[PDB]
Amino acid sequence: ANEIMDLLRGMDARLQHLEQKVDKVLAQGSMVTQIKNELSTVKTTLATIEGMMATVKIMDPGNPTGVPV
Amino acid sequence: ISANEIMDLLRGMDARLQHLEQKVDKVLAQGSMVTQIKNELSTVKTTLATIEGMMATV
Amino acid sequence: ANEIMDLLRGMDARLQHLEQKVDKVLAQGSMVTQIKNELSTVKTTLATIEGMMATVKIMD
């Protein structure tokens, strides 16, 4: 009779910390955002470096270069 | 009498499971975000690999 | 009563569905491993780049 109710509260309790463990992982995401915002800056600075090196390579009079189209 | 309290606790169980469902769906969404960051960072890596070469010739 | 236990047969069926779905959520392990590998690679390759930049020669 009452044993089943006892184990029932036990289940409620178990699930209650299921929430906690999950609450933690949901909160683990902000780190991601910042990382996306900072990788945007990584993208733009890497593109700047790429364009600068392309300009350098195309600045050698030794090898004539042609603009596409 | 007890069956009424049991009804309430089991209904609360259902609600708790719905909460877990939503939170884990948000976890799937975060996973979609991390996969986007994956492909984009891979593109970043490939671009950096492409530039290391000119480093010497120039 | 009986109605409640039928509601829990439905609700824990939803529970098996929940665990089935989070089985897919488990997949990001090797995923984060891969992203760690790529960025570490990025770090190593930019190491070479900064290494060759500091030099006495002037670019021609």
DSSP-assigned letters across all residues of C1-50: -HHHHHHHHHHHHHHHHHHHHHHHHTTHHHHHHHHHHHHHHHHHHHHHHH
Contact list in B for residue C21 (CB cut-off 8 A) is 24-25, 28
User: Is residue A8 less than 8 Å (CB to CB) from chain B?
Assistant: yes
**Nearest-angstrom CA–CA distance, C20 and C22:** 6
A39 within 8 A of B40, measured Cβ to Cβ: yes
Resolution in A: 2.9
Interface of C with B in 15-34 (CB under 8 A): 15, 18, 21-22, 24-25, 27-28, 31-32, 34
Decide if B58 and C53 are in contact by the 8 Å CB cutoff: no
Contact yes or no for A35/B40 (Cβ under 8 A): no
Q: How far is CA B49 from CA B4, C38, C52, in A?
A: 67, 11, 14
Q: Is B28 left (phi over 0), alpha (psi -120 to 50) or beta?
A: alpha
**Is residue C12 within 8 Å of B13, Cβ to Cβ?**
no
Q: What is the dihedral of CA A8, A10, A12, A13, to 10 degrees?
A: 170
DSSP string, A27-42: GGGHHHHHHHHHHHHH
- What is the C-alpha separation between A15 and B10, in angstroms, rounded? 12
Find how far residue C12's CA is from the centre of its chain: 28
d(CA B51, CA A3): 70
The experimental method is cryo-EM
**CB distance B9 to A12 below 8 Å:** yes
Three-class secondary structure of residue A50 per DSSP? helix
